[PDB]
Design a protein around this nucleic acid. Sequence first.
DNA 1: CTAAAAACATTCGTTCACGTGAGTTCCAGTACAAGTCTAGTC
Length: 94
Amino acid sequence: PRDGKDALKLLNYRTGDFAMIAYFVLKPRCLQKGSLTIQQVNDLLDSIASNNSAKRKDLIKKSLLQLITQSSALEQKWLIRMIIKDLKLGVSQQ
DNA sequence: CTAAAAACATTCGTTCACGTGAGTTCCAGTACAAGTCTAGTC
């Protein structure tokens, strides 16, 4: 719901990162065990990037829906962090 | 001559100063992670 607590929380994230809010929102909704391998995730991300380059948001929406429906809340949060390009695992790239 | 008063010699206990090995812990130093890097228009 656009006026539901989850919608405002996702939108009002003080532009405690967005990944944590998304994980909390998706916890009661998402499954407990995903079925996507690393190769499938990489293929979906590549498709999203290519469609963005080609200016076709329908395919981007379809790929995002597939990722959302075939992953768990932890997987959703990690995918969001990867897309944003901000992980902060506590260990530097070096 | 005589004993006695003074001086001298010895051993012990206590105090102190220094040196040194061992255990505990506190902290300066080091390593590492994360953020910043100019401001605006169109």
